[PDB]
Amino acid sequence: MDENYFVNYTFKDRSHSGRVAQGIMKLCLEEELFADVTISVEGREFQLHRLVLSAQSCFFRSMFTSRVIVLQDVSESVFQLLVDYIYHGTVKLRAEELQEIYEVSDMYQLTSLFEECSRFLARTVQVGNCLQVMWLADRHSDPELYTAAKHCAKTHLAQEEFLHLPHRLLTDIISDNPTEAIEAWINQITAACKHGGDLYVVSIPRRMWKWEWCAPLPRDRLQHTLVSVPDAIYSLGGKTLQDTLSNAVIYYRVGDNVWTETTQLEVAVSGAAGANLNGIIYLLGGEENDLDFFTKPSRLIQCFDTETDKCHVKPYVLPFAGRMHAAVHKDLVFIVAEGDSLVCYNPLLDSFTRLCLPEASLWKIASCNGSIYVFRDRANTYKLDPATSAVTVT
Amino acid sequence: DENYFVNYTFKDRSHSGRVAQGIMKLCLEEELFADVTISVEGREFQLHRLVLSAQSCFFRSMFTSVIVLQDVSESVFQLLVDYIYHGTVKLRAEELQEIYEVSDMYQLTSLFEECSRFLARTVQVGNCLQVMWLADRHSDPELYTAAKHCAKTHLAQLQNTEEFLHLPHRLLTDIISDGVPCSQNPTEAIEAWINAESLRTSLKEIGENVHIYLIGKEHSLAVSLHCAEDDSISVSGQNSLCHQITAACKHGGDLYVVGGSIPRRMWKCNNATVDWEWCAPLPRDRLQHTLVSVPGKDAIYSLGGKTLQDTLSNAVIYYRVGDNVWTETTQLEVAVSGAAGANLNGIIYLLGGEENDLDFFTKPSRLIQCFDTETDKCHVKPYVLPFAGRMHAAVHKDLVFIVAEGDSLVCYNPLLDSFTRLCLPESLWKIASCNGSIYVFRDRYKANTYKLDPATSAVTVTRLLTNLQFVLA
Amino acid sequence: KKVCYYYDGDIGNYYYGQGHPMKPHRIRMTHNLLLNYGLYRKMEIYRPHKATAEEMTKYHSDEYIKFLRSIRPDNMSEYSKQMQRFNVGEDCPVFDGLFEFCQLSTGGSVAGAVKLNRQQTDMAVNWAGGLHHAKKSEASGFCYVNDIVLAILELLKYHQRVLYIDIDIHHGDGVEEAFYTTDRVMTVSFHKYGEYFPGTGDLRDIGAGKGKYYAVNFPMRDGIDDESYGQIFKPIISKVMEMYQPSAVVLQCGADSLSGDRLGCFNLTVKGHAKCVEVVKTFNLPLLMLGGGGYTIRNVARCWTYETAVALDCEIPNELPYNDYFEYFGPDFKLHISPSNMTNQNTPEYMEKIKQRLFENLRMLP
Ligand SMILES: Cn1nnc(-c2ccc3c(c2)[nH]c2nc(Cc4ccccc4)nc(N[C@H]4CC[C@H](N)CC4)c23)n1
Ligand SMILES: [Zn+2]
C-alpha cells in the first residue's frame, strides 16, 4: 500500500456495525426517543422511526420520501412482530400467522424475511394445502417455493382446489394414475449409498457392486462415509489399512467411472455421518483421534463445499457425540443415535432442536418423500411427524 | 424454538450489516431525515439524533437534556462525523492530538483507543514530555507509560529540554521511579531539576545492558552491540562458543544459544563474563525450530521445526527460565519450519516457513498463525503474507516488520490485519530494533548496516564478521 | 547367586572426539566405584577377550566389518565414499582405535553369554556393552557393533526362547530389526516416542510374520516418574513371562532414563530405575545385565553401581567412598539422587489405555 503507519493510515472499525445495531436496539424500543413518525394499524398506534424503517426497507423509503399514516391490510399483531424484526432482528415465527406474514413481508421490501417465510412455507407444505401454496407461490415471485409446491402436487397427484385449477398452473404441475386424475382437468461391506435408485455398495475395500461391477476405489479404507450428491458420489474420512484415521476425499462421476482426488478435510474423522444439503456436504461427528494412539467419540461438524472444493469446521458441537446416523427431510437434517434422543439440525440457522423418542439399540433414521422413518437395530418401522413430534408404528 | 415445523425464533445474522449498510446509503449519500442541525465554526451539518445518540454517549446526553460547539474544529469534525456514519476515518499525524481530545470528550472509545495507540507509537524524545503531560491530563494509562518509558530511556538528553525544568514534582518522580540507567546519569539532571527529597530517595538506576547480539563468521563468534551516542552503534563483546550454533533467542539481556554436535544442548552468555552457563538441554530432536522469548511469562518457546525423519513437526515446547524445565504446550494448527517468529505483547506469531505440500514436499509458506500465550491456544489468520519463504521478522512498537527473500519490506499490523510495503535500497537481509530505531544488516559483506526510520521511509547508512547467520533484536 | 563381572581396564581410553555425548570413560567410573565400594571381592571379576572379527560378523555383513577394520583417522581421505553409505563419519564419529573398542565392548558381552550359556553362573554384569542401535548393514545411533545381538545369538544355541527387556529411553531399533521376523526372541522396550531419536517404536508396530505379537514396544511421554514407572513395568513383564516363559533374560539398563540426563526427557530415581532389576531378580532365571546408553557420566556411575549391588542382594550406604573420581560427584556426595520436579504428561488414563492394549497384545500370544 501507500500508507505509513507512522505518518498516515486509514482505520477501519470492525465494531461499527454492531455498535450502531445495538444502539438502535437499545435506544428505539426499550426507551422511545426521536420517533418523528406515527403509524396506525387497526387502531393500534406504533411510535416508529423514519430512518430505520427506510433503511432496510425500500417500500417505506419510496413511500416516505415521495402525520398519522394508516396501513391497509395487515393485522395489528403481524405488523407488530414485523416492527420487532425490523428493529431487533430476531423474531419468533409461528405457523398460524404464516400465510399473512409471507404476503405482508413480500409487499414490503424485506427480502430476508421473505426467504425465511418461503423456507417455512416450503418445509411445512401438506398435500391438502399444496395447491393453495402453489397459487400463493404463483401470485408472488417465488420460484423455489413454486417448485416445492410442484413436488407435493406431482408426487401426490393421484389424491376442490384441483377441480377449479387453471390450465396455466396445470401445465407446470403436469410437466414434471396420472391420466385418470388429469381426466377432470379444469372442466461384507464397509460403506454404501443410494444414487437415484442405484444402491451402490463398497474381499478388500476396493470392490464396488451396483449385481454389477464398477471402477475400484483408489484407496483402501474402512468406516469411510459416502454421500449421493446429484454431480458425483463422494467418499470422505475413514480408517486406513494401517489402523490410522483417513483424511482424503475422492469423487466418483457416474458418467465416467473415475474417482478424482480433491481437498482433504481439516480434521481426519472416521465413522462420521454424511448428509448432502443442496450441494454442501455435512459430516457428523465420528470417532476422532485421541491420545495420538487411539480414538474417542466425537461431536464435530464438517461443512465441505462441493462446488468450491473447500472444507471447514463449524465451532458448534453436536448435542450427543459418538456414532450417529442422519437423514435429510426438508431444508434440514435429522440426527439420531442410540439413546432415543432425536435432534434436528438446520444448517442455515445456528440452532439445534431436541425431541423425545420411544424408549423401546442403535437407531437408523431415514427420510422418505412422505415423512421420516426411524428404524431399530434389533423396534419395527416407525413414522413420526416432526410438527407434532408424534411417532406412529407402521 | 421448540419445533421448526410449528414455531421457532428466527435470527438474522445479516441484520446488523443490513442496518449498517442501510445507514451509509441514506444518511450520507442522499441526505434525508435530518432532524438536527449542528454547526461548527459556522459550518452547518445536517445530522440525525438517532445515529449520533446510538454511537456517542455524549451527544445523547445533549439530545435528551441547533447545537453549536466551540472546542472542535470544522475539519476534524467532518471526519469525526464521517467516522460516526461510516466507521472508517483517515488518521493523520499532524491533527491527531485534536482527534485524541475530541474523541475522548465524545466518549467515542474506539477512535479514542486507536489514537491513544497512534500517539503511543509515534512518540519521540522531541515530544515525549508534551505527550506524557497530555496523557496525564486525559488519564490514559498505556500512552502514559509508553511516553514515560521513552523519557526514562533518554533522560540524559532531556536535561536541557526546558520542559524538564518546568515540570511538576509528581511527574519527575514518576519518571525517576524506574529504569533510567546509569549511562544517562540521573543524578546530574536531578541536581539541576531543583534549580528535594523524594527525587533522591527513589531513583532506581537500571544500568545500560547490551541490546544487540550478532552471531556469525562461522570457531563461530557472537559479537555484541550497544547503540550509543547519536545514531551510532558500538561493540562490547566478542564471545566465541567454539561450537556450532543452530538456533538462538535473546531473553532479557541474555543470549540463549543452542547447538553443538547433536544440537540439543543449551548455553547462556550474560555478557558480563566470558563464562558460559549450562541450561536444560532441548528435549526434542528438531531443527529449524523458531525461538521466541516471552518476557511476560519468563519463558522461551520453541515452535515448529523439522524432525529427523524429514516430516514437519507442529509441536510447541516452552522453557521456564526460573524452574529450568522444558514443558509441552498446545500444538500449532499447521506444521512449519524456518518460520520467522515474533511475540507481540503475549501473542506469538509464526510467519511463513515451509508448509507441507500435498505431494510430500515442503513448499515455501506464507501463512500467519498466532498462538496466544495466556489462553495457550493457537489459531490461523485468514489472510496471508504477500511473499512466502525465509524471512526475518522484528517487532517494533505495536507492529511487525518482515523482510523476506528479495528487497521488499512489509510492516504488518496485527490489529488492523493490514500490511504496508516499504522498499529497501538495492541477498537475504536481516533486521532488528535497537533503542527506538530499526537496523537492517546485509547477509554477506566483503556498506554493511543500514539504519532506517519508517517515518519518511529513510535509510541512512550507519558505520567484523564475514558471515552473519543469526542476528537477535 | 553367583555374579560375573566383565570389564577391560583399557576401555576408558577410547575418546570419541571432542564434544561427543557418549564417553566410554563412564565404564571406568562404575568399575572404579565398585572397588572402593566393597563390592569387587564379592563378585567374580573376569577380563574380556577381544572378540575376533570372524566371530563379530556372525550377524553383521562381512563388508561392513572389513570397512570397520580398515577405517582410521589418517587413512580416511581415500576412505570417503564408504562413510557416506555406512552412516559413519558425522553422527558415529571415527576415533583412534575404533575397532579395538568395538572388540572390547563385544568381548565381555559374549563371554558372559557364554558363561550363562554353559549353565555355570546366574548373572553376568557387562557394563561395557549394551550398544543397541548398530543396524545390520551399517552403523546408527552412537553404536558401531550391536553386541547385544551377538549375546542373544550365543544364548539361542542352547536356550529355546529368550527375553530381552530394554529400559533405555530410546527404542533400540537395531535389536528389534535383528529379531522382527523370528519368534525365538521376545524384545520389550520401554522407550520415549514422539519426535525422538529412534522414531521407530510405536504401539502399532510388532514383529512381522513369525514374530507376530512379540516385539512389544511401549511408547511414553516425557517426565514419567518412579511411581508410574513401577506401576507400569511390573504388570507387563509378569504377564510376558507368564505367557512366554523365557529360559533366560537379557536386560539392558540404559542410563538415559535417569533424571538430569543430557539426552533424556524422563524423570527417574536410581531406586526407580534399579527396581527393574529387583523385579526381574525375583523370577529366578539366568539373567544378563548389560550397560548401554548413558550420557550423564556422574549419574551413569551412580546408577550402575546400584544394580550391581542389587544383583549381589547386598545393602550399601549412601555415603560415597573416597575413590579416584570423588571430586566429580555432587556437593552432597551421596549416591541416591532426588528427582527434579517436572510435569508427567503420562496421564493415568493414557498409561492404562496402553497397558490394556498391550494386555490383549500378549493374550493373543500362543
Ligand atoms: C542413542 N542416541 N543418543 N543420541 C542419539 C542421537 C543421534 C543423532 C542425533 C541426535 C541424537 N540428535 C540429533 N539432532 C540433529 C539435528 C537435526 C534434527 C532434525 C533434522 C535435521 C537435523 N541431527 C542428528 N543427526 C544427523 C543425522 C543425519 C546426518 N546426515 C547428520 C547428523 C541428531 N542417539
Ligand atoms: Zn539411550
Numbering used by the authors:
A (entry chain C): 27 to 92, 100 to 192, 197 to 213, 220 to 230, 292 to 306, 309 to 316, 324 to 343, 346 to 475, ...
B (entry chain A): 28 to 92, 101 to 230, 240 to 262, 267 to 474, 481 to 500, 504 to 520, 525 to 534
C (entry chain B): 10 to 375
Reproduce, without paraphrasing, sentences from the article in which this PDB structure was first reported.
Kelch repeat and BTB domain-containing protein 4 (KBTBD4) is the substrate receptor of a cullin3-dependent E3 ligase complex (CRL3KBTBD4). Recurrent indel mutations in the Kelch domain of the KBTBD4 E3 ligase rewire epigenetic programs for stemness in medulloblastoma by recruiting LSD1-CoREST-HDAC1/2 complexes as neo-substrates for ubiquitination and degradation. UM171, an investigational drug for haematopoietic stem cell transplantation, was found to degrade LSD1-CoREST-HDAC1/2 complexes in a wild-type KBTBD4-dependent manner, suggesting a potential common mode of action. The mutant and drug-induced complexes adopt similar structural assemblies requiring both Kelch domains in the KBTBD4 dimer for each HDAC2 interaction.
To determine the structure of the lower affinity KBTBD4WT complex mediated by UM171, we used the BS3 crosslinker to stabilise the binding of the CoREST1NT2-HDAC2 neo-substrate. This sample yielded 2:2 and 2:1 KBTBD4WT-UM171-HDAC2 complexes at 2.9 Å and 3.1 Å, respectively. The cryo-EM datasets for the KBTBD4WT-UM171-HDAC2 complexes yielded 2:1 and 2:2 models displaying an RSMD value of 1.55 Å across 1055 Cα positions. Superposition of the 2:1 and 2:2 states shows that the high structural conservation extends across the protein-compound and protein-protein interaction sites, indicating that the neo-substrate recruitment mechanism in these complexes is conserved regardless of the stoichiometry. The asymmetric 2:1 and 2:1:1 models allowed comparison of the equivalent KBTBD4WT site 1 in both the bound and unbound states. Interestingly, UM171 was only observed in the HDAC2-bound site 1 and not in the second Kelch domain, suggesting that UM171 binding requires both proteins to be present. Notably, UM171 binding exhibited an induced-fit mechanism requiring the opening of a cleft between Kelch domain blades II and III to accommodate the benzyl group of UM171. In the UM171-bound KBTBD4WT protomer, L356 (BC III loop) is shifted a further 3.4 Å away from P311 (BC II loop) and 4.1 Å from L335 (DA III loop) relative to the unbound site 1 in the other KBTBD4WT protomer. Similar to site 1, site 2 in the 2:1 model shows subtle conformational changes between the HDAC2-bound and unbound states. In particular, KBTBD4WT L406 in the BC IV loop shows a shift of 6.9 Å to pack together with KBTBD4WT F408 and F409 into a shallow hydrophobic pocket on the HDAC2 surface.
